[PDB]
Amino acid sequence: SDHVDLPYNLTATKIDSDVFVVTDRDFCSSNVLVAKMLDGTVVIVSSPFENLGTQTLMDWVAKTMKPKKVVAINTHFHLDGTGGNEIYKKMGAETWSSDLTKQLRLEENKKDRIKAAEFYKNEDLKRRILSSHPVPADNVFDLKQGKVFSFSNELVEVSFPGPAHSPDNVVVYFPKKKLLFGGCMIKPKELGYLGDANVKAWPDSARRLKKFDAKIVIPGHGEWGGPEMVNKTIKVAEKAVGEMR
Ligand SMILES: [Zn+2]
Ligand SMILES: [Zn+2]
Ligand SMILES: [Zn+2]
């Protein structure tokens, strides 16, 4: 079948033999891409919110893919992005983000934990959030220049299309699979949490994603789709600009 149910309400859904989406349903249905490169390297894009979810994800990756190496790419500084870094590191993964994402995560870490913890209503989820201590990635590239990974000539392209959902949001493109992980700047129905959003910039940042020849676009939350995901996002952001003036 199309998915496997994992502990802590994680879902792992197959897109093909070498591409999976793992969804943290407990924490806002956050999507994590897991792509196995031909040379055995596993690339993970984004993260579950915290340690229990991330440990569950890594246990499943270990069991099912037995990777030679794991490379984890943070999409932005939010917990669906950096929440996995502690456990990724502990498990021997190489964690990556832009320099801005690291900076924003470090700044976010200075803020009051217990006050920001009442943002969730369930007490078990609160205790899971408070039990984790998010850290930035170990390896950093310059936001504006992006980064292209080459795993035995299999390319993974990380680029900054401009501020949208957050000032630092990047997308990850896999040209071999024509797959774009757009992350939380892909919002085909409604923009969602705007705490760090640049609504005025969002339509043009999303327009810049049209350059990718994507057959599959994976959003940070919710069902994935095709290139129309980008078009839907642009209109949703425009309506927000329209009301906002
Ligand atoms: Zn199921
Ligand atoms: Zn976010
Ligand atoms: Zn998100």
Numbering used by the authors: 31 to 92, 95 to 220, 224 to 247, 250 to 261, 290 to 310
From the paper:
The São Paulo MBL‐1 (SPM‐1) was first identified in β‐lactam‐resistant Pseudomonas aeruginosa, and SPM‐1‐producing P. aeruginosa is endemic in Brazilian hospitals. SPM‐1 is a particular challenge from an inhibition perspective because it has a broad substrate specificity (catalyzing penicillin, cephalosporin, and carbapenem hydrolysis) and has properties characteristic of both B1‐ and B2‐subfamily MBLs. SPM‐1 resembles B1 MBLs in terms of its di‐ZnII ion requirement and (based on available evidence) with respect to its kinetics. SPM‐1 has unusual second‐sphere residues, and is unique amongst B1 MBLs with respect to mobile active‐site regions; SPM‐1 has an extended “α3 region” (residues 223–241, BBL numbering) and a relatively short L3 loop (residues 61–66, BBL numbering), which are features characteristic of B2 MBLs.8a No structures of SPM‐1 complexed with substrates/inhibitors have been solved, though structures in which the α3 region adopts open8a and closed8b conformations with respect to the active site have been reported.
Residues in the L3 loop (Y58) and α3 region (F151) were selected for modification and labeling with 19F. Selective labeling of Y58C and F151C SPM‐1 variants using BTFA (Y58C* and F151C*, respectively) was confirmed by intact‐protein and trypsin‐digest mass spectrometry. Notably, the naturally present cysteine (Cys221) in SPM‐1 was not observed to react with BTFA, likely because it chelates ZnII, as evidenced by S‐carbamidomethylation of Cys221, but not Cys58 and Cys151, in MS analyses of Y58C* and F151C*. The circular dichroism spectra of wildtype (wt) SPM‐1, Y58C*, and F151C* were similar, thus implying similar overall folds as supported by crystallographic analyses of Y58C. The combined biophysical and kinetic studies established that the properties of Y58C* and F151C* are sufficiently similar to those of wt SPM‐1 to justify PrOF NMR studies. Consistent with the crystallographic evidence, solvent isotope exchange studies revealed that F151C*, which lies in the exposed α3 region, is more solvent accessible than Y58C*, which is located in the less exposed L3 loop. We then tested the utility of PrOF NMR for monitoring the binding of weak SPM‐1 inhibitors, as exemplified by avibactam, which inhibits class A, C, and some D β‐lactamases,3, 4c but has low affinity for most MBLs.4b A clear chemical‐shift change was observed with avibactam and Y58C* but not F151C*, thus indicating that avibactam binding induces changes in the L3 region but not the α3 region. We then investigated the addition of β‐lactam substrates [a carbapenem (meropenem), a penicillin (piperacillin), and mechanism‐based inhibitors of class A β‐lactamases (tazobactam and clavulanic acid)] to the SPM‐1* variants.
